């Protein structure tokens, strides 16, 4: 009980030291063609499990063509966590990235 | 995709099993012949039914059939401690 | 007699409630091994074969 | 056999039904009858604004227990 | 003998002092015989056995003394004992499962599995089982899982299905805390039998002069069966093999729900709770099915018993088919459901038929404000599916209810001779897009009431004219003439016919 | 997809304490219980109950096998997603005397 | 009347059970099965 | 494309092992509709169209008292061309246990054939 | 020379960090090159 | 087409099963048996050495079901001496004959 | 070393062996003859020589020449456990055509384990056939034959937008091409549609959105394994895969009247393929 | 050697907080509040309402059932709080979606009120039956208990009529009975408290 409380406290401190804040982040402001191919993959994989959809789907039965419609309207509620190779990371919402 | 996994493996440690593999397996194997007449697996043999279900018989360890038993490990008691041939060059240096 | 000379079928069913055996041909000598052992002893090791073979109704 | 499939349904503990790990984060600190009765008055009221009805029916006996009398 | 074995089973009970467990399995193997062998324990030797096990319980709770406790619970046909033993065997289970609240894991597995037996056989099963749902309170949970684990198949015999649901409805009336998980288990496992009958439906069944078969008429020998039983498939599922199942199961539900609704329970009792656990079960289970006759008759029967219920069902049904929060195509089947409930339910007053026709015109009176000016914009003729299914839901009323709206003064109710004139001649032509036979019959009966002057506009369709799933929701009427002849007898007082 | 999900995707049982796949076992239950998942080399046999007044067992740590024994402990197992050949690799490495300790993150 | 054909002397041969598979004019062991009047259908394509 | 198959039964005995499984059908049991593909001796009518799963011979064994068949264990539809009854040379009194059966898989020039 | 390197790793008591793509296909972990070089996190609205 | 097997789950019926996708033995009514396999083993006499030849039939993919005695061998050892007729055992009925 | 263990010399020797589970030591079979496994012949011979040294362990309890067979037993109790793990680390008897492989020979080759069944697995949902040309399909397309189009399936979870198309797939069933082969219930139980008739499919397509009674699986929804369609995609593969453009991703375009995979000429320089009888692998 | 060997085994089995006898009533207090942490799986249908999803999937099937980790019967929960994966409180938290599946796993804190009976404690409950072998009871109208014969005092006799009871003074005992707790049994899906009457 004390050995877990002093263990969660380490873990939330380690992950606090690795979070780069939003003003210090210095990676590319574009969506890097793998982020695009996984956002559309993960969003289409959530839509097919009856997640709430934020677009007027006009009879589209492919889940992947629905998620390509939400990426065009910046309605996807996902966050890219870009890892730097020490383990530290930067959070980028899909709304603020730039689509090629 | 409707059966998610929670816990996940992130690092693998190599080691050496000690003398107390005997603790994880009280199903020693003595009889070298694997079957007898009437097609049955003989007890204390290499196809013993405490190593996993076999020949339409339930497992003596899991209590489960052939489709759902993971299978289990037994051990052969060496009477004299032979050396492991992987680590033989790395004891002949220390010798 | 049937426990020493013959064969009861394996498992746990046909041995305690209701017995089930089969007269195998490999124990048709062994039953007659001790039938003829008593008759030999009744005449003090002088066996009269042909009147016994009409009595035992065999060849 | 069939019972090897019934115990897959008798267990029925997936990672959707059950949490992966549970850890107590502090020590269990005891409460008073004035705090149990204050909680059960609020826990039953929250769920009654499915499942859980077979459970709440066992809590109302305990709510009847700490103050009332059969 | 009977005084001699009393010192035998006490001597077998003495396996705790020196811990040998000698005569445990010998007694336990004689009590584990079937009813087809007269060599089992009899009514005299069992009371020798049972009363020693009821006078002490400490000298049985061993891991080796556990074995005979199985065969006393697995003592089959125990509901057929004489009352010197039956009223004493029940007393043993009531002390085993209360001294040790661990065998109700395994005793309630038996009592629920023995719900194949009828009501006249399970009078003593439930009266034990009602006792432990109050004495063992933490058994509301895992007995719910037993009632789904032991419900029979879709295609077992009828004796297992009609008498499980008969014993299951018995368990509802004495355990209202379960309640919802009773009806969810029924209605979902009636759809399995139900939906396999409309696609089969071609010809009327033979009305055989024998309606019921027979009255009450009353070893393992296992081999190594692993080979073939090939080319003996007989996979030819019958007509009456599922029509008579849907008769006897679903008549029995309507019988049990008619008993449990009454105006004296709708005032301060639990008869409201029977209704709401079917209404939420209606809008979640049956309403998203496709092509389902013969299960919306359950809500049809129940929402016809009292007038307050139809004041809490029709207002529920309008809130489905007109809310924006609902789905794109749940707002058409429910309009298709609304038109066929008003036009076939008998026990309603005028003030409820009017208030449907009040809103079903007032929604169409609001329709002139916005959704009639989008005809000129470039789009398909099927953006307004919500409109055509609403107009079908009102023209199917007049084809059946055309004499309720006749008043004594000689008018109509909010211009019934005038409002349909404007809606038909308008800029949508609903004489074409809706189902034909529901619309061909509206004009003919309005021709006999001198309202429709639009029989060339019907002929102006051969040159005036996602379409298949718009036909298919309109050729579906939830309250068609039923095919089940045993269950129609219940509904003949409740169901308006064609005429 | 190609080298895991469409070839040999199996969900195995891994003890979080010793980190092993092969030495887990679904327990033969006592008749009034449910067959749970238990590890074998973390498990101590129930006769080892050697002796704050006493150190008695919480009655849900004890499980049995089909031979008939009893074992205290051996819980704290979880389910991970491995290829099945990893389960066969670990049996080929035990036969050389080599164990693979898996470190599984939710602890 | 079911028949076979000897592979050597081409003599038609009904072969009952509990008979050795031999010709009965010569003694030839290999013995080939004839075809009888039986319907099979084809498309002429 | 002609293609043969050796339906043998004597592969699973010893020198003194008696004849376990015969040819032809049995009695006191009736798996029907094998008589469309097969003749009274448990061998196919030659000239018969077959597909996968179709019976190719019927052998009645005596350690089951059951008329078992074995199926056409290939997925292209053939025609039975020849059925040869192989006799026995080691003695003069055993029943038939080897049948070599020849198929005729017709092969028109489909798309994808090298010329 | 699989068991030659295995000898050098077992004597080392070497923790494999499971980061190379030849070690992630063995344990069945997602590869860290390309679309496995980041994480997708979903943003839930309610507290 | 089917083969005899155990009873299917889901409270199906006493059923007999049938492999359909070569590894999923369904029941008669189409319920795939959960956790079924149909194993095999690969060969591309010769091509290696022969340990022994223990004779099993192995139609249950691993486990074997046939090739055992004292089940129908019970009625096989006592039938052959009573199957053939004309035994020349005929002691007094032959005078009648 | 955070666990502060001890390096002990017993770790170099072998006190016990461990027997692998029976599933990993099943008997072999070829044709109609079952044989004993490789891992029992090397592993019984340790256990007979363990027995034979206990047979001779009684020959000092009642008590030269017997120590010339005792010391002979220690060399061959070593040479059997040596031949259990390796097989090149033994001596053997004769030319036994490269004798019985140990547990190192199962790992170290091109074949074996670590390169044949970890880097090189065989896959489900894959088809190969001879390729044929087509200039009428697109450049980013493949022509799937109708033979492959009624076999390869995709698990499509049924939701409120694909219910109109997945009902039509179950009605067509696993023979007519825009169809489906089996459905998956919310408890994971599969229901195969192959033996069923046109009535057991229509009366099971109508139950794709019916919620189950169970509350543990109230999240999930059914999965209809529809056939491959023109909106599906496919990895295609020419077999010597010397660079990453030899394994590209095509869009399916299902054709009638064929048995050959069918390709466009823009792709045939990428895969280094020509239409002389080459086969390509189609992964789905 | 063994002084710091079994300490990692004995302290695995010693329960943490002992139940006190309180308010000069003699009865112990077994309802306790423990804060815990979970690792649960939010599903995509509850991706808009995350707190309803963690309650309905993982917390509601946990009430009135014995949990091994808290060591008791979980009554209810209070103060569910999802830990954000963004160490920036706020409404727009975010969880981490697994790569293979569309689900998300996350940490949560919650306070569980559990019922914690232990040995040597005092529990008073109604007697619901009593027979010629035991005294059967409830506890708090929900929890089954029993007192068997070998822990019934010798000065108490079972008068027979079902049957009433005779104490050491010739009195029928009522439903409400005070007794001292023996081994609490767990292994079923029913929590059983075996008890004693002797001191
Ligand atoms: Zn097992
Ligand atoms: Zn472990
Ligand atoms: Zn001839
Ligand atoms: Zn089934």
UniProtKB/Swiss-Prot annotation, chain C:
Superkingdom, natural source: Eukaryota
Cellular location(s): Nucleus, Nucleolus
Chain's role: DNA-dependent RNA polymerases catalyze the transcription of DNA into RNA using the four ribonucleoside triphosphates as substrates. Component of RNA polymerase I (Pol I) which synthesizes ribosomal RNA precursors. Besides, RNA polymerase I has intrinsic RNA cleavage activity. The heterodimer formed by RPA34 and RPA49 stimulates transcript elongation by Pol I. Subunit RPA49 can bind both single-stranded and double-stranded DNA.
S-S bonds: none
Family to which the UniProt record says this protein belongs: Belongs to the eukaryotic RPA49/POLR1E RNA polymerase subunit family.
Organism, as annotated: Saccharomyces cerevisiae (strain ATCC 204508 / S288c) (Baker's yeast)
Residue runs in coiled coils: none
Protein name: DNA-directed RNA polymerase I subunit RPA49
Residue numbers of the full-length protein present here: 298 to 356 of 415
Subunit structure: Component of the RNA polymerase I (Pol I) complex consisting of 14 subunits: RPA135, RPA190, RPC40, RPA14, RPB5, RPO26, RPA43, RPB8, RPA12, RPB10, RPC19, RPC10, RPA49 and RPA34. The complex is composed of a horseshoe-shaped core containing ten subunits (RPA135, RPA190, RPB5, RPO26, RPB8, RPB10, RPC10, RPA12, RPC19 and RPC40) where RPA135 and RPA190 form the DNA-binding cleft. Outside of the core, RPA14 and RPA43 form the stalk that mediates interactions with transcription initiation factors and newly synthesized RNA.
UniProtKB/Swiss-Prot annotation, chain I:
Modified residues (Phosphoserine): 20
Location in or out of the cell: Nucleus, Nucleolus
Note in the entry: Present with 2840 molecules/cell in log phase SD medium.
Role: DNA-dependent RNA polymerases catalyze the transcription of DNA into RNA using the four ribonucleoside triphosphates as substrates. Component of RNA polymerase I (Pol I) which synthesizes ribosomal RNA precursors. Besides, RNA polymerase I has intrinsic RNA cleavage activity. RPA190 and RPA135 both contribute to the polymerase catalytic activity and together form the Pol I active center. In addition, subunit RPA12 contributes a catalytic zinc ribbon that is required for RNA cleavage by Pol I.
Complex formation: Component of the RNA polymerase I (Pol I) complex consisting of 14 subunits: RPA135, RPA190, RPC40, RPA14, RPB5, RPO26, RPA43, RPB8, RPA12, RPB10, RPC19, RPC10, RPA49 and RPA34. The complex is composed of a horseshoe-shaped core containing ten subunits (RPA135, RPA190, RPB5, RPO26, RPB8, RPB10, RPC10, RPA12, RPC19 and RPC40) where RPA135 and RPA190 form the DNA-binding cleft. Outside of the core, RPA14 and RPA43 form the stalk that mediates interactions with transcription initiation factors and newly synthesized RNA.
Protein family according to the UniProt entry: Belongs to the RNA polymerase beta' chain family.
Name of the protein described by the UniProt record: DNA-directed RNA polymerase I subunit RPA190
Organism this protein belongs to: Saccharomyces cerevisiae (strain ATCC 204508 / S288c)
From Swiss-Prot, chain J:
Zinc finger boundaries on the chain: RRN7-type: 1-34
Region: B-linker, residue numbers: 61-95
Region described as B-reader: spans on this chain: 35-60
Binding site for Zn(2+): 8, 13, 27, 31
Compartments reported by the entry: Nucleus, Nucleolus
Domain of life (superkingdom): Eukaryota
Main function: Component of RNA polymerase I core factor complex (CF) that acts as a SUA7/TFIIB-like factor and plays a key role in multiple steps during transcription initiation such as pre-initiation complex (PIC) assembly and postpolymerase recruitment events in polymerase I (Pol I) transcription. Binds rDNA promoters and plays a role in Pol I recruitment. After binding of UAF (upstream activation factor) to an upstream element of the promoter, CF is recruited in a SPT15/TBP-dependent manner to form a pre-initiation complex.
Additional record remark: Present with 398 molecules/cell in log phase SD medium.
Entry's family note: Belongs to the RRN7/TAF1B family.
Subunit composition and interactions: Component of the core factor (CF) complex, which consists of RRN6, RRN7 and RRN11. The CF heterotrimer may further dimerize to form a hexamer. RRN7 interacts with RRN6, RRN11, SPT15 and RRN9.
Record note on domains: Although it shares weak sequence similarity with SUA7/TFIIB, displays a similar subdomain organization as SUA7/TFIIB, with a N-terminal zinc finger, a connecting region (composed of B-reader and B-linker regions), followed by 2 cyclin folds.
Official protein name in the record: RNA polymerase I-specific transcription initiation factor RRN7
Segment of the intact protein contained: 3 to 103 of 514
Swiss-Prot record, chain L:
GO MF annotation terms: DNA-directed RNA polymerase activity
Entry keyword Lipid metabolism: no
GO cellular component: nucleus; RNA polymerase I complex
Coiled-coil ranges from the UniProt annotation: none
Top-level taxonomic group: Eukaryota
PTM remark: Contains an average of four phosphates per molecule.
GO biological process terms held by the UniProt record: nucleolar large rRNA transcription by RNA polymerase I; ribosome biogenesis; termination of RNA polymerase I transcription; transcription by RNA polymerase I; transcription elongation by RNA polymerase I; transcription initiation at RNA polymerase I promoter
Modification sites for Phosphoserine: 192, 199
Location within or outside the cell: Nucleus, Nucleolus
Additional notes on this entry: Present with 4070 molecules/cell in log phase SD medium.
General function of this protein: DNA-dependent RNA polymerases catalyze the transcription of DNA into RNA using the four ribonucleoside triphosphates as substrates. Component of RNA polymerase I (Pol I) which synthesizes ribosomal RNA precursors. Besides, RNA polymerase I has intrinsic RNA cleavage activity. Through its association with RRN3 is involved in recruitment of Pol I to rDNA promoters. In vitro, the A13-A43 subcomplex binds single-stranded RNA.
Family per record: Belongs to the eukaryotic RPA43 RNA polymerase subunit family.
Protein name: DNA-directed RNA polymerase I subunit RPA43
Organism: Saccharomyces cerevisiae (strain ATCC 204508 / S288c)
Gene encoding the protein: RPA43
């Amino acid at each position: 009980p004390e050995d877990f409380q002093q263990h969660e406290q380490i873990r939330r401190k380690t992950l606090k030291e690795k979070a780069i804040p939003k003003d210090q982040r210095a990676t590319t402001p574009y969506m890097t063609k793998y982020e695009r191919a996984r956002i559309l993959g993960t969003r289409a994989l959530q839509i097919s499990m009856n997640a709430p959809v934020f677009v007027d789907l006009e009879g589209e039965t492919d889940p992947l063509r629905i998620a390509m419609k939400e990426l065009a309207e910046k309605k996807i509620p996902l966050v890219i966590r870009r890892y730097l190779p020490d383990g530290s990371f930067e959070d980028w919402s899909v709304e603020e990235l730039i689509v090629d | 995709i409707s059966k998610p996994v929670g816990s996940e493996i992130t690092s693998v440690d190599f080691g050496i099993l000690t003398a107390k593999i005997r603790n994880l397996s009280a199903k020693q194997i003595t009889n070298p012949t694997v079957l007898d007449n009437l097609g049955h697996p003989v007890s204390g043999g290499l196809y013993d039914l405490a190593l996993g279900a076999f020949l339409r018989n339930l497992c003596s360890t899991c209590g489960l059939d052939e489709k759902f038993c993971p299978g289990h490990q037994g051990h052969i008691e060496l009477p004299v401690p032979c050396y492991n041939p992987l680590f033989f060059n790395q004891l002949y240096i220390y010798l | 007699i049937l426990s020493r000379f013959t064969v009861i079928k394996p498992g746990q069913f046909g041995r305690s409630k209701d017995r089930s055996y089969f007269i195998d041909p490999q124990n048709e000598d062994k039953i007659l091994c001790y039938i003829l052992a008593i008759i030999m002893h009744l005449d003090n090791f002088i066996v009269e074969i042909t009147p016994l073979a009409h009595e035992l109704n065999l060849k | 056999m069939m019972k090897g499939s019934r115990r897959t349904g008798n267990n029925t503990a997936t990672t959707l039904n059950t949490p992966v790990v549970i850890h107590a984060t502090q020590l269990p600190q005891h409460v008073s009858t004035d705090e149990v009765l204050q909680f059960l008055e609020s826990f039953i009221d929250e769920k009654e604004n499915t499942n859980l009805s077979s459970s709440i029916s066992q809590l109302k006996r305990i709510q009847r227990d700490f103050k009332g009398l059969p | 003998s009977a005084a001699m074995y009393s010192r035998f089973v006490k001597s077998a009970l003495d396996d705790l002092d020196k811990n040998d467990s000698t005569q445990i399995g010998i007694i336990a193997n004689q009590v584990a015989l079937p009813s087809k062998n007269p060599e089992r324990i009899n009514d005299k030797n069992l009371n020798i056995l049972l009363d020693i096990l009821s006078s002490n319980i400490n000298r049985i709770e061993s891991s080796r003394g556990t074995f005979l406790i199985q065969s006393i619970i697995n003592f089959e046909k125990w509901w057929e004992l004489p009352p010197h033993t039956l009223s004493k065997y029940i007393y043993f289970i009531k002390i085993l499962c209360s001294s040790i609240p661990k065998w109700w894991q395994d005793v309630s597995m038996i009592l629920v599995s023995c719900f194949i037996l009828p009501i006249k056989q399970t009078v003593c099963h439930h009266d034990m089982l009602k006792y432990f749902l109050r004495m063992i309170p933490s058994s509301m949970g895992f007995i719910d899982t037993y009632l789904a684990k032991f419900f029979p198949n879709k295609n077992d015999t009828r004796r297992k299905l009609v008498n499980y649901t008969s014993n299951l409805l018995k368990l509802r009336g004495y355990c209202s805390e379960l309640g919802f998980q009773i009806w969810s288990l029924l209605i979902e496992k009636i759809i399995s039998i139900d939906v396999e009958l409309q696609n089969e439906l071609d010809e009327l069944d033979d009305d055989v002069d024998d309606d019921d078969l027979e009255e009450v008429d009353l070893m393992d020998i296992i081999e190594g069966m692993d080979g073939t039983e090939e080319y003996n498939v007989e996979l030819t599922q019958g007509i009456k093999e599922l029509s008579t199942k849907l008769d006897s199961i679903l008549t029995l539900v309507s019988t049990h729900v008619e008993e449990q609704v009454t105006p004296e329970s709708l005032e301060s009792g639990e008869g409201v709770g029977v209704f709401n656990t079917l209404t939420t079960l209606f809008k979640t289970h049956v309403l998203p099915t496709y092509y389902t006759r013969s299960i919306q008759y359950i809500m049809f029967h129940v929402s016809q018993q009292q007038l307050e219920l139809m004041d809490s069902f029709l207002v529920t049904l309008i809130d489905i088919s007109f809310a924006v929060n609902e789905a794109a195509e749940k707002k058409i089947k429910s309009l298709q459901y609304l038109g066929s409930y008003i036009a076939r339910a008998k026990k309603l007053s005028r003030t409820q038929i009017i208030f449907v026709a009040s809103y079903l015109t007032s929604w169409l009176n609001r329709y002139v404000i916005e959704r009639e000016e989008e005809v000129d914009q470039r789009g398909g003729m099927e953006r307004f599916k919500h409109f055509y299914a609403a107009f079908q839901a009102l023209c199917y009323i007049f084809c059946f209810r055309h004499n309720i709206f006749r008043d004594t003064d000689g008018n109509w109710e909010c211009e019934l001779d005038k409002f349909f004139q404007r809606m038909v001649i308008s800029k949508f032509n609903p004489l074409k897009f809706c189902n034909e036979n529901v619309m061909l019959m509206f004009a003919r009966i309005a021709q006999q009431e001198s309202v429709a002057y639009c029989f060339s506009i019907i002929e102006n369709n051969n040159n005036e004219r996602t379409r298949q799933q718009f036909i298919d929701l309109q050729s579906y009427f939830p309250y068609d003439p039923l095919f089940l002849k045993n269950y129609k007898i219940l509904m003949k007082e409740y169901y308006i016919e064609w005429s | 997809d190609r080298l895991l999900n469409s070839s040999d995707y199996t969900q195995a049982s891994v003890c979080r304490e010793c980190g092993s796949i092969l030495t887990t076992q679904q327990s033969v239950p006592r008749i009034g219980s449910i067959s749970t998942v238990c590890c074998r080399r973390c498990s101590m046999r129930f006769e080892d109950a050697k002796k704050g007044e006493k150190i008695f067992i919480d009655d849900s740590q004890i499980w049995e096998d089909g031979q008939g024994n009893k074992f205290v402990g051996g819980n704290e197992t979880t389910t991970v997603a491995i290829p099945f050949v990893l389960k066969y690799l670990d049996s080929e490495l035990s036969a050389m005397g080599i164990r693979l300790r898996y470190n599984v993150e939710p602890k | 009347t079911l028949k076979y054909i000897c592979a050597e002397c081409s003599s038609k041969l009904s072969l009952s059970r509990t008979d050795a598979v031999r010709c009965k004019d010569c003694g030839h062991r290999i013995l080939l099965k004839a075809r009888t009047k039986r319907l099979v259908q084809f498309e002429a394509r | 494309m002609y293609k043969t198959e050796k339906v043998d039964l004597a592969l699973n005995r010893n020198r003194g092992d008696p004849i376990t499984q015969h040819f032809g059908f049995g009695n006191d049991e009736w798996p029907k509709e094998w008589l469309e593909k097969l003749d009274e001796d448990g061998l196919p009518y030659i000239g018969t169209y077959v597909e996968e799963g179709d019976p190719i011979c019927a052998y009645f064994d005596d350690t089951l008292n059951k008329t078992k068949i074995k199926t056409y264990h290939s997925s292209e539809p053939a025609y039975i061309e020849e059925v040869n009854l192989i006799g026995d040379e080691s003695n003069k009194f055993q029943e038939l246990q080897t049948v070599s059966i020849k198929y005729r898989i017709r092969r028109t020039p489909q798309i994808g054939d090298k010329f | 020379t699989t068991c030659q390197f295995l000898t050098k790793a077992v004597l080392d008591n070497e923790r494999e960090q499971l980061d190379s793509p030849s070690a992630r296909i063995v344990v069945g972990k997602l590869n860290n090159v390309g679309t496995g070089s980041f994480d997708v996190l979903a943003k839930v609205p309610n507290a | 087409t089917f083969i005899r097997g155990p009873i299917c789950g889901t409270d199906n019926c006493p059923s007999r099963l049938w492999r359909i996708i070569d590894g999923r033995r369904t029941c008669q009514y189409g319920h795939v048996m959960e956790g079924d396999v149909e194993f095999n083993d690969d060969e591309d006499l010769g091509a290696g050495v022969i340990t022994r030849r223990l004779n099993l039939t192995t139609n249950a993919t691993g486990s074997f079901q046939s090739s055992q005695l004292t089940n129908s061998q019970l009625l096989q050892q006592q039938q052959r001496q009573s199957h053939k007729k004309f035994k020349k055992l005929i002691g007094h009925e032959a005078k009648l004959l | 070393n955070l666990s502060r263990k001890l390096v002990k010399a017993d770790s170099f020797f072998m006190d016990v062996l461990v027997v692998p589970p029976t599933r990993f030591r099943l008997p072999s079979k070829l044709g109609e003859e079952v044989h004993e496994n490789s891992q029992n012949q090397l592993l019984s011979k340790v256990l007979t020589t363990s027995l034979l040294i206990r047979d001779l362990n009684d020959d000092l309890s009642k008590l030269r020449v017997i120590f010339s067979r005792l010391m002979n037993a220690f060399v061959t109790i070593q040479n059997d456990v040596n031949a259990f793990i390796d097989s090149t680390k033994a001596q053997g008897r004769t030319s036994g055509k490269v004798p019985i492989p140990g547990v190192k020979q199962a790992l170290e080759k091109k074949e074996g384990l670590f390169r044949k069944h970890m880097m090189g697995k065989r896959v489900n949902y894959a088809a190969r056939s001879v390729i044929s040309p087509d200039p009428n399909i697109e450049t980013n397309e493949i022509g799937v034959p109708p033979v492959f189009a009624v076999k390869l399936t995709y698990p499509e979870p049924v939701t409120a937008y694909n219910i109109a198309e997945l009902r039509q797939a179950v009605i067509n069933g696993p023979d007519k091409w825009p169809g489906a082969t089996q459905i998956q219930n919310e408890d994971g139980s599969l229901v195969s549609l192959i033996g069923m008739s046109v009535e057991q499919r229509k009366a099971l397509a109508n139950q794709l959105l019916t919620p189950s009674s169970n509350v543990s699986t109230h999240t999930l929804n059914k999965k209809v394994y529809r056939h491959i369609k023109n909106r599906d995609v496919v990895l295609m593969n020419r077999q010597p895969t010397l660079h990453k453009a030899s394994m590209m991703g095509h869009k399916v375009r299902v054709l009638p009247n064929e048995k050959t995979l069918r390709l466009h000429y823009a792709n045939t320089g990428a895969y280094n393929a020509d239409f002389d009888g080459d086969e390509m692998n189609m992964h789905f | 050697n063994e002084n710091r060997e079994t300490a990692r085994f004995i302290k695995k089995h010693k329960k943490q907080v002992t139940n006190p006898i309180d308010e000069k009533n003699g009865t112990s207090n077994c309802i306790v509040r423990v804060p815990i942490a979970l690792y649960v799986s939010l599903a995509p249908m509850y991706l808009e309402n995350p707190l309803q999803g963690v309650m309905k999937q993982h917390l509601n099937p946990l009430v009135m059932k014995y949990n091994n980790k808290v060591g008791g019967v979980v009554l209810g929960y209070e103060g569910l709080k999802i830990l954000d994966a963004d160490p920036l409180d706020t409404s727009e938290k975010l969880i981490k979606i697994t790569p293979d599946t569309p689900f998300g796993f996350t940490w949560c804190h919650v306070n569980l009120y559990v019922w914690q009976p232990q040995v040597g404690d005092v529990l008073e409950g109604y007697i619901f039956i009593q027979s010629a072998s035991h005294i059967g009871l409830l506890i708090h109208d929900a929890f089954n208990a029993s007192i068997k014969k070998n822990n019934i005092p010798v000065d108490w006799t079972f008068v027979h009529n079902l049957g009433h009871w005779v104490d050491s003074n010739g009195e029928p005992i009522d439903g409400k009975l005070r007794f001292t707790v023996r081994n609490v049994h767990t292994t079923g899906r029913v929590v059983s408290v075996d008890g004693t009457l002797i001191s």
